[PDB]
């Protein structure tokens, strides 16, 4: 279904700028506390995350982060095919989340276009 | 205030009695739990651990507290006797994997910030 | 050397148990410091303290002497005996 | 833009780059340091400065409800370009 | 209607439960201390510990009371009050279908008499409290530890007990077994500071002093 | 997708990648933050 | 009136050995009680109306993986609430933690009048509203 | 007496006539939601959230400024009161911009909390909102003026508290904008406090700008050490890292404000730091090493030399516990040159009497004084909180403030007697007219700063001021209990050191040069290598090695004031405690633990081993330094006056000039300040001009 909750990913605006303004709402929401953010005033100024890591082994795949996000920055992509071999492989990083949002992007855009009215 | 309700024991003497046959049971137990659980512990170094644990709570003077330790040791005794406990839990009292901890202030200063 | 290096006085604020020493330093202190200007007579006055006297001589040894309800002449004597023993 | 470290590692958009000794680089041998090339710092700079002619301008980030919350930036200061804090598009008066 | 969001108010059940509360207060004045019915039609009876067996029996046996079902049994640790632990008995009626709650208090050491006989369901629930709060129960048939791991210590639901516990366990090849080690987290629990400093409900304001 | 062209944009990958776990192209976690409290550089001039 | 074979027990409770706290956590750790000062960024008050106890902060090192905040003491993010400081100190002694006491600081009530914003001779006259 | 009975929604309370309604409600516990009234600021009745219903009254009245009358049951929870609150907030929250995820006030916004408690749950604003262009007013305060609610708290803080009347309002109607019109540079010593008076994120902290959402940071109480005031503060630390410092309420030390120097000083902790022990290599460079060899070298050459050849100069930010530990360690070799950077004239009583070196009348005592004499100080930068207290007493209690010395501008209209110190003895003579004022004032005041004592003729200045105090004390105008003598210090860890018996100043070292100088936090640089003889084991402890560290043989890293758990003393003598917020960086330990371990390695082991024992030992040394948060009553002034009064040491004609003369030098004082970068940013902001430090506040 278009609501399927899977691998977390960090989307970005059509201009290419990342949507995350590091409000840390998702960190204050995650019941498993799998999300960690450090913010900073960027060189341009926009308050992006110096660190944004989701501990997938702590994550319980609830979709609370996306519904908490006020800019639809964090989302859960339709991918479930990320069974890994090492525990460190599961512990994601900001760059890994950005790559996830840049690989599963047409998917997430199409699903959001078909689901934003419900939510 | 000072007046309180007992659990079983009325005075230090009777609780002192209860710990007596608790140590009785532990003594008569240690060898055949070494035998049954295939312990790597030896008989003497089994008994002295019981003695040191009994001496650990030497400071206790309130009666009700003594009934509490004696009934908790009673639960320990049941857990051990009918093999509900497991060999790892029996070893848990003996701190093997736990590295030795320094005691002097100088070593504490060398290691890190800790009182 | 062993001569006393500093003399510390701990007198209570208002309690009568430390009254006498309070009178002592009230009148019998200025000339006492004039006699030994080099010597640190410290007066670390505080509240609800029993009137006590520390004496640090040398090498880090200290001597303890109470002044509980000590009269002005009596505290004068308990200072003079220590000060005279410049060793 | 992504640049190489003196050791050879690819610096990140945050500026992270493990130093010379930095024993925590064995993690990357026989592997790779995953870095995203689409830097958000520069992918917003080349966007054109909108020349909408009004005193105060609304911005939702495009896509309506799919964008960021609607903010009213002020196109008042003549010496700089107003920008929405969420998205980052630079809005400016059409040279008054 | 005018109040489509606010929950419906059922005053008839409230008055009827209050009448039964006065009933039970009059019947057993020896152990009952304070009976009150909540706004959402749930009555609670605060009794002295010595009434754990009597009051329950009166609630289990009396023709006009007729409560034979132990819905649950629970302790609620609160370190502030002098006797920190408070035990709640939840009873449900069949002939007169309704839910009643009786609440008693005890500290760490003062034992509270074990129901079991009044409600044989209490037994396992009973064990939980002893294994989870330290509240020992007098002459309980078998008050052994029930939930926690073997050879455990403390009573985790005590509010002073840390969230992460004290000791974990893991494989050790040096001894070829699972061993217990003092706690060393890989990432510490961040304790968020919620509960905004602005008063929420004026109705439940604590009186000053 | 032939009948439903996905909305194209610059940042989307032009080549799908399977899960790279196992092969040396796998991902390894690492702190993506700058440095904490920074060390004081000793002087280079002589002691005197 | 409450006959249950009552016994005078003068010495204070020693539930320490019952609590299961390890020896160095019951000995070394020092806990302080206090009324938490309100966040000066806020004018709300109902957070300094309780007695909270908290323990001395311990080592906080960064793990090699992401520089997280791994710690060792479990009794670090543990704070206990109490209505009055007497209950808190009783809990502290009966548990056996070395305790420190800070008195409940409260705002002094100051005389405030809008008529002070204006004056004929007093310095308190304002210059702008 | 005059207490009038006033009901609040029922139950009645006893209320002083003239009390506002909101204070009467606070007497019970229920609080009016407000945005315009601050307890320590003037009232304006502006937010209109203070509206409440008076029983049998047609229209609601503003509880912020309403003299309560007889009876007058305050219906706090009345339906009309709730409706008034709802409407007033709907008006407040109409043009408020959608920045909650992007605004740092998020989670502790006040406005958000009132919306949660007393506010609607939906917006009927169908029109466009208002946007206001940002006005930069510093590298210290982030400015997003579209979020402002015109509560006028910043303006009133600028006028009364800070005294710099530059923050105002412009225009009218909905286009009214609060700012500075001119692109002016608001650089007072109390500017940062506007961050904590602004209910909304209109004004925020630039150095901390969006570093942590404040619902995560743990809060640990402690004491500021940047100043001798010892302002109570709270360190907000997340994930083992210091983010910011907020003021704590004390009402006797700092009210609820702190100086910008105190506030924005955490960044110094993250800069140049000492973490691992260092020793001089074969070429003379300090190379990193383990602890063992460092304590071994220290122990060896401490064992080699005894007597006066071993010294120790305590710095400015040191702790009392390590002061005791170092003094005791240096005592076991009979070394008695325990010096400190700040100099106090020891001629006469010296450090023997608490009355000599103390703000005897306490900080609060200045709120009832009549006339105050400042002996050549700059309290706007020497002690910002003390000057704030002086300003508030000048405002409300019409204090007549006069000073002798440098004509530094001091917010209020100070009466500049002059600059020459000669005037001092004239005041003692009484020929100067101001003397009569001191006689006529029922609570006269004279205070001489530590900086003016530093000079070169401090003994003469102290003697003259003591003679002045004695001359006015014999008059019956001053009550028996009212203290007059007052000495204001600047270094935080000076009075405590002087309490322990450390010889003030460094003259002892210069008299007979030592060989094993134990620089403990010493960073002023009063004693350099040239003054010392050849082959001196200068051992520099501390945290921020910038002056002492370059000239050293073995470096012993220490803990900063936010990492230890030691005690400090304010200028009035009250001994406060700083709790541990974040662990010391790297391998650095506490300052007393390292001294005790050094002693144990060297052989002369100290008796105390944990914090409680060293506190008990310090109690043995001085019984006031353990009694926390209460001024130990200091007296015995007259005998101290008769004690010195022997030397003449004729006063030099040099005008009194405090080392700090303009806000530019208020920032760069200690090692922590020098390490900081934001301190340098604001310094360069002050120096050249306005257009140098503009930091974009929108992002
Ligand atoms: S689904 Fe997302 S927000 Fe929820 S716990 Fe997992 S990572 Fe956190
Ligand atoms: S909720 Fe969204 S915008 Fe806020 S920190 Fe999380 S990902 Fe970023
Ligand atoms: S200050 Fe304004 S933007 Fe910031 S949280 Fe409050 S209401 Fe939201
Ligand atoms: S800028 Fe802040 S303090 Fe000043 S009036 Fe606006 S909201 Fe109030
Ligand atoms: S308090 Fe009523 S408007 Fe400020
Ligand atoms: K603010
Ligand atoms: Zn935008």
Task: State how far residue F13 is from chain G, nearest Cα, in angstroms.
Answer: 27
Residue G3's φ and ψ, nearest 5 degrees, are -60, 110
Q: How far does residue A73's CA lie from ligand 1's centre (Å)?
A: 13
d(CA D70, nearest CA chain A) in Å? 11
CA distance A116 to B102: 61
Determine the distance in angstroms separating the CA of A113 from the nearest CA of chain G, rounded to an integer: 35
Domain that holds residue C6: 2-87
Assess contact for H568 and H539: CB atoms under 8 A.
no
Ligand 1 binding pocket mutation candidate from A27, A34, A91 (most atoms within 8 A of CB): A34
CA distance between the termini of chain G: 69
User: Which residues are CB-neighbours of H464 under 8 A, at least 6 positions away?
Assistant: H421, H424, H425, H427, H428, H651
Burial H666-695 (b: 16+ CB within 10 A, else e): bbebbbbbbbbebbebbbebbeeebeebeb
H313 to H333, H338, H544, H595, H614: CA distances (angstroms): 16, 6, 16, 14, 20
Within the 64-83 window of chain D, which residues sit less than 8 Å (CB to CB) from chain H?
69-74, 76-77, 83
A80 annotated as a binding-site residue = no
Task: Enumerate residues 6+ apart whose C-beta is below 8 A from B99.
Answer: none
**What are the beta bridge partners of residue G53?**
G33, G80
- Cβ-defined contact of F32 to G66 (cutoff 8 Å): yes
Measured CA to CA, the distance from residue E23 to residue C14 in angstroms comes to 63
Indicate whether residue A74 lines ligand 2 (CB < 6 A). yes
The CA distance from A32 to the nearest CA of chain E, in Å, is 10
Cα(H95) to ligand 6 centroid in Å equals 18
d(C-alpha H223, C-alpha H392), whole Å: 23
What is the β-pairing status of strands H71-75 and G98-101? unpaired
Inter-chain touch A36–G68, beta carbons under 8 Å? yes
Q: In 10 A of CB C38, how many CB atoms?
A: 6
The torsion angle over the Cα atoms of residues H65, H69, H71 and H77, rounded to 10 degrees, is -10
Query: Do the strands H218-223 and H232-237 form a parallel or antiparallel pair, or are they unpaired?
Result: antiparallel
3-state secondary structure G23-49: HHHHHCCEEEEECCCCCCCCCCCCCCC
Q: In chain E, which residue's Cα lies nearest the Cα of G20?
A: E154
Q: Measure CB to CB from residue A84 to each of F21, F30, F33 and give the nearest one.
A: F21
Here the tokens at position G117 are 């914003």
Q: Which atom of ligand 4 sits closest to the CA of residue H200? A: 7
Cβ(H74)–Cβ(H13) under 8 Å?
no
> Alpha carbon of E68 to those of D87, E57, E115: distances in Å?
64, 10, 13
Q: Which residue do the tokens 């505080």 mark?
A: C46
Q: Name the residue of chain G whose CA is nearest to A55's CA.
A: G66
* H154 known ligand binder: yes
Of ligand 3's listed atoms, the one at least distance from the Cα of H103 is 4
H308 DSSP assignment: G
Does B13 reach chain G within 8 Å, measured CB to CB? no
Beta bridge partners of H555: H278, H540
- Identify the residue among D5, D29, D34 best suited for mutation to test binding to F, counting F beta carbons within 10 A and taking the highest: D34
| DSSP class of H79 | H
Asked if H630 contacts H570 with a C-beta cutoff of 8 angstroms, the reply is: no
Cα–Cα distance between H184 and H167 in angstroms, integer? 9
* Residue H103 near residue H109, CB atoms below 8 Å: yes
Closest ligand 2 atom to A29 CA: 1
* G39 and H CB contact within 8 Å: yes
Locate the ligand 4 atom nearest the alpha carbon of residue H147 and give its number.
7
CA distance E111 to chain B (A): 7
Pocket test for ligand 4, best of H46, H96, H150, H201 (most atoms within 8 A of CB): H150
DSSP string, E132-186: HH---EET-S-----SS-TT--S-TTSTTS-TT-SEEEEEETTTTEEEEEE---S
Q: Which has the closest alpha carbon to H413: G118, G123, G116, G127?
A: G123
Q: F–C contact (≥3 CB pairs within 8 Å)?
A: no
Shortest distance between the Cα of G77 and any Cα of chain A, in A, equals 15
Ligand 5 atom nearest to CA at H64: 1
Question: Cα separation of E100 and E114, whole Å?
Answer: 19
Cα separation, H259 vs H386, in Å, equals 11
Longest dimension (CA), chain C: 38
Count Cβ neighbours within 10 Å for each residue of D50-71 and write b for 16 or more, e otherwise.
Answer: beeeeebbebbbeeeebbbbbb
Phi-psi region of H225 (alpha: psi -120 to 50; beta: other; left: phi over 0): alpha
Strands H177-179 and D82-83: unpaired
SS3 label, residue E46: strand
Interchain contact, F27 vs D34, CB within 8 Å = yes
Q: Where are the beta strands (DSSP E) in H394-499?
A: 400-404, 415-418, 444-449, 487-488
How crowded is residue H635: how many other Cβ atoms within 10 Å of its Cβ? 16
| H114 Cβ inside 6 Å of ligand 5 | no
**Where does chain B show beta strands of DSSP type E?**
3-4
Q: Do A71 and D61 touch (CB under 8 A)?
A: yes
Measured over the CA atoms of residue H177, residue H181, residue H185 and residue H189, the dihedral's sign is: negative
Rounded to whole angstroms, the Cα distance separating H309 from E32 reads 80
List the structure tokens of H439: 């006689």
The DSSP output letter for H40 is: T
Q: For chain C, what is the domain count?
A: 1
Please give the Cα distance from H400 to H406 (Å, whole number): 18
Q: How many CB atoms lie under 10 A from the CB of residue H395?
A: 21
Q: Which bin fits H658, alpha (ψ -120 to 50), beta or left (φ > 0)?
A: beta
DSSP code of residue H583: P
CB-based contacts of A5, cutoff 8 Å, min separation 6: A61, A62, A63, A76
CA dist C56 and C64 (Å) reads: 9
- From chain F residues 19-48, the ones with a CB under 8 A of any chain G CB are 29-33, 36
Residue entry with tokens 């407040």: H92
- Chain A CB contacts of G68 below 8 Å: 36
Beta-carbon separation of F11 and D38 below 8 A: yes
Elucidation method: cryo-EM
* Strand duo D82-83 + D71-74: pairing: unpaired
Q: Which backbone phi and psi does H101 adopt, to 5 degrees?
A: -65, -25
The 3-class secondary structure across H341-367, one letter per residue, is CCCCCCCCCCCCECCCCCCCCHHHHCC
Cβ–Cβ contact H589 with B under 8 A: yes
Which ranges of H371-433 does DSSP label H, i.e. alpha helix? 379-382, 384-396, 422-429
Of the ligands numbered here, which is closest to the C-alpha atom of D85?
7
Spatial separation of the C-alpha atoms in residues B35 and B43, rounded to whole Å: 9
Interface contact H699-A46, CB threshold 8 A:
yes
Residue E2's alpha-carbon distances to E39, F15, H118, H124, in angstroms, are 20, 59, 21, 20
Contact (CB, 8 A) for H316 and H496: no
> If DSSP codes are grouped into helix, strand and coil, which group holds residue G67?
coil
Beta carbons of C20 and C50 less than 8 angstroms apart: no
Start-end of H helices in H478-567: 495-500, 507-511
Q: How far apart are CA H195 and CA H257, in angstroms?
A: 11
Mutate to test the interface with E, among G6, G12, G74 (most CBs of E within 10 A): G74
3-state SS, H99-145, equals CCCCCCCCCCCCHHHHHHHCCCCCCCCCCCCCCCCCCCCCCCEEECC
Return the residue of E nearest to G75 by Cα: E162
Tokens of B41: 């512990």
CB H259 within 8 A of CB H267: no
Is the CB of H200 inside a 6 Å radius of any atom of ligand 4? yes
- Centre of ligand 1 to C-alpha A30, Å, is 5
Contacts of D56 in chain H (CB under 8 A): 128, 130-131
Q: Is the CB of H158 under 6 A from ligand 4?
A: no
The answer to whether H47 is a known ligand-binding residue is: yes
Interface residues of B toward E, Cβ cutoff 8 Å, are 4-5, 7, 62, 64-65, 68, 71, 75-76, 78-79, 84-89, 91-92, 96-98
- Please state, in angstroms and as integers, the Cα–Cα distance from residue H269 to each residue in H97, H524, H656, following that order: 35, 18, 34
| H51 Cα–ligand 5 center, Å | 7
**Residues contacting G49, CB < 8 A, separation 6+:** E206, G35
Return the domain boundaries, chain B. 1-115
Residue H71 annotated as part of some ligand binding site = no
């Amino acid at each position: 279904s278009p609501r399927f909750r899977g691998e977390h990913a960090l989307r970005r605006y059509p201009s290419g700028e990342e949507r995350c303004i590091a409000c840390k709402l998702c960190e204050a929401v995650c019941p498993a506390q799998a999300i960690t953010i450090e913010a900073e005033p960027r060189a341009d100024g926009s308050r992006r995350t110096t660190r944004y890591d989701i501990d997938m082994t702590k994550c319980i795949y609830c979709g609370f982060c996306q519904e908490a996000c006020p800019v639809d920055a964090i989302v859960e992509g339709p991918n479930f095919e990320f069974s890994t071999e090492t525990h460190e492989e599961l512990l994601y990083n900001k760059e890994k989340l950005l790559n996830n949002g840049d690989k599963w992007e047409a998917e997430i855009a199409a699903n959001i276009q078909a689901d934003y009215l419900y939510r | 205030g000072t007046s309180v309700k007992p659990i079983f024991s009325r005075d230090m003497n009777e609780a002192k009695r209860r710990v007596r046959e608790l140590y009785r049971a532990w003594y008569r137990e240690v060898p055949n739990t070494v035998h049954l659980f295939q312990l790597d512990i030896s008989v003497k170094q089994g008994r002295d651990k019981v003695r040191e644990m009994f001496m650990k709570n030497a400071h206790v003077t309130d009666p009700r507290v003594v009934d509490l330790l004696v009934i908790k040791g009673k639960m320990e005794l049941e857990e051990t006797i009918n093999v509900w406990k497991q060999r790892t839990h029996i070893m848990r009292f003996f701190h093997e994997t736990e590295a030795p901890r320094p005691t002097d202030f100088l070593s504490k200063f060398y290691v890190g910030h800790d009182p | 050397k062993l001569g006393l290096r500093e003399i510390r006085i701990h007198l209570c604020q208002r309690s009568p148990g430390s009254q006498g020493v309070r009178d002592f330093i009230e009148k019998r202190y200025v000339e006492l410091k004039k006699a030994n200007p080099d010597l640190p007579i410290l007066i670390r006055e505080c509240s609800d303290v029993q009137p006590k006297l520390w004496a640090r001589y040398a090498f880090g040894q200290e001597k303890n002497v109470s002044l509980n309800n000590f009269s002005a002449d009596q505290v004068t004597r308990t200072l003079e005996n220590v000060l005279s023993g410049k060793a | 833009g992504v640049r190489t470290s003196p050791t050879g590692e690819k610096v990140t958009h945050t500026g992270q780059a493990y130093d010379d000794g930095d024993y925590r680089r064995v993690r990357f041998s026989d592997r790779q340091k995953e870095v995203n090339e689409n830097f958000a710092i520069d992918l917003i700079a080349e966007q054109p400065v909108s020349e909408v002619g009004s005193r105060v301008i609304s911005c939702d980030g495009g896509g309506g409800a799919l964008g960021h919350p609607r903010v009213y930036i002020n196109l008042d200061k003549e010496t700089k370009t107003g920008t929405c804090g969420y998205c980052g598009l630079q809005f400016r008066q059409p040279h008054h | 209607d005018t109040r489509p969001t606010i929950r419906p108010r059922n005053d008839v059940v409230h008055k009827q439960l209050s009448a039964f509360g006065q009933y039970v207060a009059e019947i057993l004045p020896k152990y009952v201390q304070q009976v009150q019915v909540s706004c959402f039609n749930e009555l609670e009876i605060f009794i002295h510990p010595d009434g754990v067996i009597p009051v329950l029996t009166f609630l289990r046996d009396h023709t006009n009371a007729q409560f034979k079902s132990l819905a649950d049994l629970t302790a609620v640790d609160v370190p502030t009050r002098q006797n920190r632990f408070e035990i709640v008995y939840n009873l449900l009626s069949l002939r007169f279908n309704s839910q009643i709650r009786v609440k008693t208090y005890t500290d760490e050491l003062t034992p509270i008499e074990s129901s079991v006989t009044v409600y044989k369901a209490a037994n396992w629930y009973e064990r939980e409290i002893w294994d989870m709060f330290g509240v020992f129960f007098a002459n309980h048939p078998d008050l052994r530890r029930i939930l926690t791991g073997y050879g455990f210590e403390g009573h985790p639901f005590r509010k002073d007990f840390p969230l992460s516990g004290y000791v974990e366990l893991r494989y050790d090849d040096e001894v070829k077994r699972v061993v217990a080690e003092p706690v060393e987290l890989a990432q510490e629990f961040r304790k968020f500071d919620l509960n905004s400093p602005w008063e929420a409900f004026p109705a439940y304001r604590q009186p000053p002093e | 997708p032939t009948t439903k062209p996905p909305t194209a944009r610059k940042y989307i990958w032009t080549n799908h990648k399977f899960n790279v776990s196992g092969t040396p192209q796998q991902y390894v976690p690492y702190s993506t933050t700058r440095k904490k409290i920074q060390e004081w550089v000793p002087p280079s001039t002589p002691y005197k | 009136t409450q006959d249950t074979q009552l016994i005078a027990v003068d010495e204070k409770l020693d539930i320490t050995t019952l609590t299961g706290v390890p020896e160095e956590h019951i000995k070394t750790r020092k806990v302080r009680i206090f009324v938490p000062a309100r966040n000066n960024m806020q004018s709300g008050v109902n957070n300094t109306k309780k007695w909270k106890m908290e323990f001395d902060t311990r080592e906080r090192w960064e793990n090699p993986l992401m520089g997280w905040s791994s710690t060792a003491d479990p009794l670090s993010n543990l704070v206990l609430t109490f209505s009055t400081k007497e209950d808190a100190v009783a809990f502290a002694e009966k548990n056996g933690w070395s305790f420190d006491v800070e008195e409940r600081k409260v705002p002094k009530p100051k005389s405030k009048s809008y008529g002070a914003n204006f004056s004929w001779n007093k310095r308190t006259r304002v210059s702008t509203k | 007496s005059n207490l009038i009975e006033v009901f609040v929604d029922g139950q009645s309370v006893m209320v002083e006539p003239g009390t506002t309604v909101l204070q009467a409600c606070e007497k019970v516990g229920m609080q009016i939601p407000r945005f315009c009234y601050h307890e320590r600021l003037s009232v304006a009745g502006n937010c209109r959230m203070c509206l409440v219903e008076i029983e049998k009254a047609p229209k609601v009245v503003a509880a912020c400024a309403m003299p309560v009358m007889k009876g007058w049951n305050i219906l706090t929870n009345s339906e009309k009161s709730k409706k008034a609150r709802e409407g007033v907030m709907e008006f407040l929250l109409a043009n408020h911009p959608l920045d909650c995820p992007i605004c740092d006030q998020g989670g502790e916004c006040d406005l958000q909390d009132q919306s949660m408690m007393f506010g609607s749950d939906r917006s009927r604003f169908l029109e466009g909102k208002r946007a206001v262009e940002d006005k930069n007013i510093g590298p210290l305060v982030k400015t997003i003026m579209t979020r402002c609610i015109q509560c006028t708290r910043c303006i009133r803080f600028a006028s009364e508290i800070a005294g710099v009347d530059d923050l105002g309002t412009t225009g009218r109607g909905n286009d009214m904008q609060v700012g500075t019109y001119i692109e002016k540079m608001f650089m007072s010593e109390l500017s940062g406090n506007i961050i904590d008076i602004c209910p909304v994120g209109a004004l925020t902290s630039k150095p901390y700008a969006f570093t942590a959402r404040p619902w995560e940071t743990r809060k640990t109480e402690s004491i500021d050490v940047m100043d001798a005031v010892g302002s109570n503060i709270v360190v907000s630390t997340r994930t083992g890292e210091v983010m910011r410092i907020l003021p704590r309420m004390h009402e006797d030390i700092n009210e609820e404000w702190i100086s910008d120097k105190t506030r924005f000083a955490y960044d110094g902790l993250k800069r140049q730091r000492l973490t691992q022990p260092m020793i001089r290599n074969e070429k003379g460079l300090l190379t990193y090493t383990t602890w063992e060899d460092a304590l071994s070298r220290v122990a060896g050459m401490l064992q080699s030399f005894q007597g006066n050849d071993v010294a120790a100069i305590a710095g400015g930010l040191v702790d009392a516990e390590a002061l005791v530990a170092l003094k005791d360690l240096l005592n076991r070799v009979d070394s008695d040159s325990l010096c400190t950077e700040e100099v106090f004239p020891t001629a006469g009583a010296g450090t023997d009497l608490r009355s000599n070196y103390l703000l005897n009348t306490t900080i609060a005592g200045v709120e009832e004084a009549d006339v105050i004499l400042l002996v050549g100080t700059n309290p706007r930068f020497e002690a910002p909180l003390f000057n704030a207290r002086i300003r508030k007493s000048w405002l409300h209690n019409d204090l007549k403030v006069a000073l002798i010395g440098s004509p530094v501008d001091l917010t209020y209209r100070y009466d500049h007697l002059g600059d020459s110190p000669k005037i001092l003895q004239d005041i003692a003579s009484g020929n100067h007219p101001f003397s009569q004022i001191l006689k006529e004032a029922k609570k006269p005041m004279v205070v001489l700063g530590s900086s003016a004592l530093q000079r070169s003729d401090g003994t003469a200045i102290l003697a003259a001021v003591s003679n002045i105090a004695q001359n006015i004390r014999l008059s019956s105008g001053v009550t028996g209990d009212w203290k007059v003598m007052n000495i204001l210090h600047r270094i935080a860890s000076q009075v405590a050191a002087l309490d322990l018996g450390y010889k003030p100043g460094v003259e002892a070292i210069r008299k007979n040069p030592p060989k094993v100088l134990f620089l403990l936090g010493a960073d002023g640089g009063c004693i350099t290598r040239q003054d010392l003889p050849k082959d001196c084991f200068i051992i520099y402890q501390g945290h921020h090695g910038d002056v002492g560290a370059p000239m050293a043989d073995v470096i012993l890293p220490g803990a900063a004031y936010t990492e230890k758990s030691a005690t400090y003393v304010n200028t009035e003598g009250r001994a406060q405690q700083t709790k541990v917020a974040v662990t010391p960086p790297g391998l650095a330990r506490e300052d007393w633990k390292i001294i005790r371990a050094l002693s144990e390695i060297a052989g002369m082991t100290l008796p105390y081993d944990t914090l409680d024992q060293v506190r008990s030992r310090l109690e043995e040394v001085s019984p006031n330094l353990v009694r926390y948060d209460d001024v130990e009553g200091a007296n015995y002034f007259q005998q101290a006056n008769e004690l010195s009064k022997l030397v003449n040491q004729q006063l030099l004609a040099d005008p009194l000039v405090p080392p700090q003369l303009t806000i530019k030098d208020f920032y760069m004082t200690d090692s922590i300040s020098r390490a900081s970068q934001t301190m340098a940013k604001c310094v360069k902001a002050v120096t050249e001009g306005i257009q140098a430090v503009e930091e974009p506040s929108i992002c």
